[PDB]
Amino acid sequence: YKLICYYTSWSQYREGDGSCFPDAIDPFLCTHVIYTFANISNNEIDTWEWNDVTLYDTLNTLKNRNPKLKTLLSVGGWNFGPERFSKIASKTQSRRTFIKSVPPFLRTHGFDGLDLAWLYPGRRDKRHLTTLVKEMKAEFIREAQAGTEQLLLSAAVSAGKIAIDRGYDIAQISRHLDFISLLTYDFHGAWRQTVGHHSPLFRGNEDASSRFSNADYAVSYMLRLGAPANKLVMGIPTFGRSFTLASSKTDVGAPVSGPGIPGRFTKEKGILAYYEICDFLHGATTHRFRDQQVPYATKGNQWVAYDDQESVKNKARYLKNRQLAGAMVWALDLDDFRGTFCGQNLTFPLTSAVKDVLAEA
């Protein structure tokens, strides 16, 4: 099985124990670590942070200890606007320029591949994404002739049915990609004025937003669209999402006034790192959504949907049962990478739980 793990370049800047550099990553934890994100500038791949050449080197130094570890560099993300990808992918010349720039940059920096994280392709982009993936793979095939093991090509793909339908030709891009990481953790609509879970494995009993807004639906639908199971990797979050409650109510359908207050370390309303949730749980009441198979917790006016060791184990057992290629974790810097917040003196408790289940049989 593959265990694909993202590291984000901006996590370095978090205050105190929040700060995460790539030497905090256990070299044997994941099969693949993806550094996120690269820029695109003058239609060529490029660095983003001031110190990315340094941190790329710190990541790639992990392979001294684990020579089998593979690294990838992800291009795009939400700070890069989808419109920027669109402009590059939609024209033969800019697409070629970009694609030609990729292998030398990856080689120089010690990466084993490229991950595409276009968030997200529209209706007008679908055919261009197909061309970009096909043509980038073709360039990786040519570059391999100069003697070094062929670069890997992956993509991070929406897990929302409407987004999938609008933007991706899954049957075609699956042929050329080495794996597809399914973003099975953005299932609570931005529009909703109630609490809910963003990463449920199955639908809830009572007005799920769709029958579609759950990991099981997403996996099934990618298989049905022609993604072979051995190309599909299911995403599992190490962060949770938070809400400010509008009333004393906390169970299904509880109204909310907006996102939850930011975490001390991650400083972003509506999201909390797992290590922050560990701490939040002190004094919190914990609940599970029985049919969705994922937990939430509440205290004061704050309500948090999250994933725990149990839930991520459960998701790993599911994905093996569906004979998928493995798991993807977003993100190492949001798991308890220091080991010191979650009461177990164990680094990477979520990601490690996933690993441990992938090895079972």
Ligand X SMILES: *[C@@H]1O[C@H](CO)[C@@H](O)[C@H](O)[C@H]1NC(C)=O
Contact 38, 114 (CB under 8 A): no
The structure tokens listed for 67 are 């020579």
Determine if residue 59 is labeled as part of a ligand binding site.
no
Give the nearer residue to ligand X in terms of CB position, either 48 or 303.
Answer: 48
What DSSP assignment string belongs to 162-195?
HHHHHH--HHHHHHH-SEEEEETT--S-TT-SB-
Question: Which residue matches tokens 């599970």?
Answer: 288
250 near ligand X, rule: CB under 6 A: no
Task: Kindly state the smallest distance separating residue 137's Cβ from ligand X, in Å.
Answer: 24
Contact 143, 96 (CB under 8 A): no
Give the nearer residue to ligand X in terms of CB position, either 42 or 345.
Answer: 42
Give the nearer residue to ligand X in terms of CB position, either 39 or 302.
Answer: 39
Determine if residue 118 is labeled as part of a ligand binding site.
no
Determine if residue 79 is labeled as part of a ligand binding site.
yes
How many other CB atoms are there within 10 angstroms of residue 107's CB atom?
Answer: 14
**Which residues in 246-321 belong to E strands, given as ranges?**
256-259, 271-273, 285-289, 294-299, 302-305
Give the nearer residue to ligand X in terms of CB position, either 41 or 344.
Answer: 41
Residue with the shortest CB distance to ligand X: 41
Give the nearer residue to ligand X in terms of CB position, either 41 or 220.
Answer: 41
| CA atoms of 192 and 197, how far apart (whole Å) | 11
Determine if residue 77 is labeled as part of a ligand binding site.
yes
Task: Kindly state the smallest distance separating residue 73's Cβ from ligand X, in Å.
Answer: 14
Determine which residue in the list 14, 19, 39, 63 makes contact with ligand X, applying CB under 6 A. Answer: 39
Task: Kindly state the smallest distance separating residue 43's Cβ from ligand X, in Å.
Answer: 9
Task: Kindly state the smallest distance separating residue 114's Cβ from ligand X, in Å.
Answer: 17
Give the nearer residue to ligand X in terms of CB position, either 48 or 221.
Answer: 48
**Which residues in the chain belong to E strands, given as ranges?**
2-8, 32-41, 44-46, 70-76, 113-117, 152-158, 179-183, 232-237, 239-245, 256-259, 271-273, 285-289, 294-299, 302-305, 326-330
Task: Map residue 284 onto helix, strand or coil.
Answer: coil
98 near ligand X, rule: CB under 6 A: no
Task: Kindly state the smallest distance separating residue 80's Cβ from ligand X, in Å.
Answer: 8
Determine if residue 241 is labeled as part of a ligand binding site.
yes
Of residues 59, 65, 76, the one with CA closest to residue 112: 59
Task: Kindly state the smallest distance separating residue 288's Cβ from ligand X, in Å.
Answer: 41
51 near ligand X, rule: CB under 6 A: no
Give the nearer residue to ligand X in terms of CB position, either 76 or 204.
Answer: 76
Question: Which residue matches tokens 């996933």?
Answer: 354
C-alpha distances out from residue 217 to 117, 165, 327, Å = 21, 14, 16
How much of the chain is helix, strand and coil, in % rounded to 5?
A: 35, 25, 40
**Per-residue string for binding with ligand X, 56-95, x by CB under 6 A?**
----------------------------------------
Determine if residue 183 is labeled as part of a ligand binding site.
yes
Determine if residue 120 is labeled as part of a ligand binding site.
yes
The structure tokens listed for 296 are 């939430």
Determine if residue 78 is labeled as part of a ligand binding site.
yes
Question: Which residue matches tokens 């308890």?
Answer: 336
Determine which residue in the list 17, 23, 41, 210 makes contact with ligand X, applying CB under 6 A. Answer: 41
Determine which residue in the list 48, 168, 289, 337 makes contact with ligand X, applying CB under 6 A. Answer: 48
Contact 345, 281 (CB under 8 A): no
Give the nearer residue to ligand X in terms of CB position, either 41 or 285.
Answer: 41
Task: Kindly state the smallest distance separating residue 56's Cβ from ligand X, in Å.
Answer: 15
Torsion of CA 299, 281, 28, 1, to 10 degrees: -60
Task: Kindly state the smallest distance separating residue 55's Cβ from ligand X, in Å.
Answer: 14
**Annotated binding-site residue numbers for chitin:** 49-50, 76-79, 120, 183-186, 241, 330
**Annotated binding-site residue numbers:** 49-50, 76-79, 120, 183-186, 241, 330
- Contacts with ligand X, residue ranges (CB under 6 A): 39, 41, 48
